[PDB]
Amino acid sequence: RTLIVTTILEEPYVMYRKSDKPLYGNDRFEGYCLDLLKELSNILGFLYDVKLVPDGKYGAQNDKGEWNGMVKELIDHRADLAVAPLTITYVREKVIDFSKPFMTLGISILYRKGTPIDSADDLAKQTKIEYGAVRDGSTMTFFKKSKISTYEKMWAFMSSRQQSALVKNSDEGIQRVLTTDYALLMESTSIEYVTQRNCNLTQIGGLIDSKGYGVGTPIGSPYRDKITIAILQLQEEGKLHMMKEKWWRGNGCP
Amino acid sequence: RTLIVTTILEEPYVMYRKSDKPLYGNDRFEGYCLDLLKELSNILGFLYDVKLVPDGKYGAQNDKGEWNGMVKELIDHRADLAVAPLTITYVREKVIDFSKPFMTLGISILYRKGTPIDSADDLAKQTKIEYGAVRDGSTMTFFKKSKISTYEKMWAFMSSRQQSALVKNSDEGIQRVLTTDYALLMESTSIEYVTQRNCNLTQIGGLIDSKGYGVGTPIGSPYRDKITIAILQLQEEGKLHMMKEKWWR
Amino acid sequence: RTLIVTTILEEPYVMYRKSDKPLYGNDRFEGYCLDLLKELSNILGFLYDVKLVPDGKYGAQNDKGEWNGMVKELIDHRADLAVAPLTITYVREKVIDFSKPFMTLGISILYRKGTPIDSADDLAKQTKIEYGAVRDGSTMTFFKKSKISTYEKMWAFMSSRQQSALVKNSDEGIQRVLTTDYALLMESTSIEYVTQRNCNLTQIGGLIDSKGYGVGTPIGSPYRDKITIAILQLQEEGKLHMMKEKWWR
Amino acid sequence: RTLIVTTILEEPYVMYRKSDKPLYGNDRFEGYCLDLLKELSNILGFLYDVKLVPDGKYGAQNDKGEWNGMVKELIDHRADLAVAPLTITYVREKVIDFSKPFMTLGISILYRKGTPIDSADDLAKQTKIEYGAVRDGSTMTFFKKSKISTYEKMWAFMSSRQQSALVKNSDEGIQRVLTTDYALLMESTSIEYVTQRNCNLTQIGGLIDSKGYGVGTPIGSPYRDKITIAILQLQEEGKLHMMKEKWWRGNGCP
Ligand SMILES: C=C(C)[C@H]1CN[C@H](C(=O)O)[C@H]1CC(=O)O
Ligand SMILES: C=C(C)[C@H]1CN[C@H](C(=O)O)[C@H]1CC(=O)O
Ligand SMILES: C=C(C)[C@H]1CN[C@H](C(=O)O)[C@H]1CC(=O)O
Ligand SMILES: C=C(C)[C@H]1CN[C@H](C(=O)O)[C@H]1CC(=O)O
Ligand SMILES: [Cl-]
Ligand SMILES: [Cl-]
Ligand SMILES: [Cl-]
Ligand SMILES: [Cl-]
Ligand SMILES: [Cl-]
Ligand SMILES: [Cl-]
């Protein structure tokens, strides 16, 4: 049968292909996650139908404990796989079955060049430089759920004033960094992609934590273990590394 | 029921506790993996019995394709869990159910300081400096199975002369690096621990791959997903980081 | 049964948690004493409900000898435990059962930096600099009841002019020290916290006595000895020290 | 009735009085603890009979979980109070009812003057300078029971070679410090007493922990709370402070 794959537009993981003609079906998309999906398909022998998540969200839990985004798509069995930069977290792993990571990463800081700023600590000990994260993303959830002091502190600032320091998406975060005195808490993988296209931007400091992106499947899915096995193979063969090189190269920045 | 936990002595993950008197049961052991196991048992509410793997192996296949080591213990249901620096790999994941990694790592190079060697490619291009890995470990298997040109070249070197360039265990590899002109392909986390204790040694280059250590369970185990979830929580709370800091310094 | 825990807002022991949205129940509060209470509940296995003391007092007697504050709450069995910077004193210990101290302290002097004042004796000998304490706190009562010459002199000064030199609470005492020529007799642990946040202020001299904060229970409570034992264990494990470090820095 | 008070000889808490005639009864003894006992007696209105603990020990638990020393005296109801420098610890509080502390203290280091040594950390990071504690005392038990790294380390050294770095009592520890390259882990109160009599000795660093001496009573004793109340009063009246000054003065050392 044919698997329904939920995904979301996010450079360079999943993007609209460029063409002069209207596009249809899976041919609408290209990017790292599409190449990964093709490799998984070839290895496991399934057909797939790529569908953008209707609410345009990744997956977060509200006050009632109700889920949204690609996570909710899986929970309701409206999709068989989620293939996207979907961060493997404690709260999400409790509600879906993630494959093992196809890409590792950590929270870090995107900022303009030329400044004394060197760490998260630097930001937490002042109020002049604004800083935030994408609202309801795993990065925000990390700061909110944290019981570590410095990150407890950054959260209190981030969420203050009705969350005015937060952004709705990465592109908005990037523009805010480029225009104003603002630093975006962003996943290192996305920082690496952006800083190789726009030589005005840089990563500040190292990785604040350690996690990965995983293919999402519903709890009890027969495909999860098979996908994990295929990802392990692709990693061992150097394939995932090439795929990352391919999509992350960009224009080149020093 | 008290869970049977297979493991293996390996610094600083699992070590004999130093005492003036004889030790018994779980009290014989200390280290990163013991601290992990204690945290896991508290979170999930299980009792456990730590048991050294009888053949003292991690887990590989012979030419007949029979497994050994901690991996065989799980396949055969002689253990409920394996808690050790057991590398999550394609071959192993097909026969047991790993939790998600509690520690990430990659293959890198342990060598002495002060050399001009800067990468695996530097080693592959030459024959003066000897290099190898622990026989039947995931690192050796990585080289054996690679179709990458540089790594194929390295594998031909390592398997030459009836695998004289290989060592039986990490301690042997370390002494070999210290004494002779030899570089050990070794997991990055272990190199970190070694170079903090041997100030004449260093890591050469970066990581040539990306993988993890996971808790091993038999295929179908009801503990695997619970342990994954517990591990994700310990990571997010910064406890795993703290545990590594304690044992690595 | 869920235990009723009486307490009082006082930095940094018990504070309202900062949030963008309204808070409810125990989630309203954070601080040293909340961390202590959580550790205690985990060790002893009790659930608890934190309740601010309705009259907002620690616990003293009026001239009729009736008690108020958290102390009265315990005497009257309106609370199971009091967890707060509640000083273990002779008068209080006679009417409630304190656990052993979770924190030690002594009365000392909070004053501005750059003065030549070096001791309580320096204050007692003069009348230019005003000094006082929080009305009805254990510090005031210490001075009221002392037969030590220097402390008697200080008490006559403090009770002069209808106790104009006294303040209703610590925050008031702190602002008074910052603004005017005034020294506050204050518990050393609180001075430590204040001087880390007000870099123009300092402790003057050493501790003039030795006492502790303890968890309060009604006389006869079956929780008192268990809580003492839990506290001794947290102290020995270095956890209380860590808890203080977290909140005081 | 008359209370049986178990105690042990330890300067300057409990000592044989000096006299030219043989001494009997309570008149054999003097020191801080005797003055404290007298004050407690006057306040509560009891008579007392002071008895040295027969096995000459404070109180520690063996392999079977059997107790000895003054602690065991109380457990077996052979004594009503223990009045001595008996350290209030977790393991002991589980088996007797301690009063609240009459004196506070912490573990610290007794050593010869003139050295670079400044902390416990200094000692733990070498093997040349020997260091230990009184065998089976609460200080030893602290290092043994510890899960803190530096003290975990010191314990392993201390207990090595069949505990050759340990001593049987404080006097032996003091002589060992004065004669050899040895540092004694000792309670600060006793360090203060010794360093004011022997100007060749000094405390190294500060307090490693925080505890007190308490009057011991058996679990369920009717006297414990009354004694706590009396101690609180004595402390508030400045009496305990004077008593300490009186017995700790010694010869004077810079
Ligand atoms: C909003 C984006 C782009 C996603 C991607 N991974 C995280 C997630 O899966 O929640 C989010 C990023 C972040 O929270 O920094
Ligand atoms: C022989 C050791 C120490 C083990 C540990 N992890 C790898 C494994 O789980 O196979 C081996 C190391 C290596 O192959 O570099
Ligand atoms: C009014 C406060 C803050 C309390 C705290 N402890 C003492 C008590 O428990 O009475 C008071 C302070 C003092 O009297 O210096
Ligand atoms: C061996 C002595 C003198 C006693 C005194 N207090 C401790 C106790 O009550 O165990 C011991 C000292 C120590 O362990 O440093
Ligand atoms: Cl530009
Ligand atoms: Cl998994
Ligand atoms: Cl081969
Ligand atoms: Cl008590
Ligand atoms: Cl009066
Ligand atoms: Cl001399």
Swiss-Prot record, chains B, C:
The PTM Phosphothreonine maps to T195
| Tissues/organs with expression | Expressed in the olfactory bulb (at protein level). Expressed in subsets of neurons throughout the developing and adult central and peripheral nervous systems. In the CNS principally in the medial amygdaloid nuclei, medial habenulae, pyriform and cingulate cortices, and Purkinje cell layer. Also highly expressed in embryonic and adult dorsal root ganglia. Expressed at high levels in the trigeminal ganglion neurons.
The residues exposed to the Extracellular compartment are: 116-249
Subcellular localization(s) per the UniProt record: Cell membrane; Postsynaptic cell membrane
Glycosylated residues: list them. N200
Lineage, top-rank taxon, reads Eukaryota
Positions contributing to L-glutamate binding: P85, T87, R92, S138, T139, E187
Positions modified as Phosphoserine?
S159
Q: What's the stated role of this polypeptide?
A: Ionotropic glutamate receptor that functions as a cation-permeable ligand-gated ion channel, gated by L-glutamate and the glutamatergic agonist kainic acid. L-glutamate acts as an excitatory neurotransmitter at many synapses in the central nervous system. Binding of the excitatory neurotransmitter L-glutamate induces a conformation change, leading to the opening of the cation channel, and thereby converts the chemical signal to an electrical impulse. The receptor then desensitizes rapidly and enters a transient inactive state, characterized by the presence of bound agonist.
Q: How does this polypeptide assemble, per the annotation?
A: Homotetramer or heterotetramer of pore-forming glutamate receptor subunits. Tetramers may be formed by the dimerization of dimers. Can form functional heteromeric receptors with GRIK4 and GRIK5. Interacts with KLHL17.
Something else the entry says is: The postsynaptic actions of Glu are mediated by a variety of receptors that are named according to their selective agonists. This receptor binds domoate > kainate > L-glutamate = quisqualate > CNQX = DNQX > AMPA > dihydrokainate > NMDA.
**Which family is annotated?**
Belongs to the glutamate-gated ion channel (TC 1.A.10.1) family. GRIK1 subfamily.
Query: Can you say what this protein is called?
Result: Glutamate receptor ionotropic, kainate 1
Which organism is this entry from?
Rattus norvegicus (Rat)
Its gene name is Grik1
Interval of the full protein contained in this chain:
447 to 815 of 949
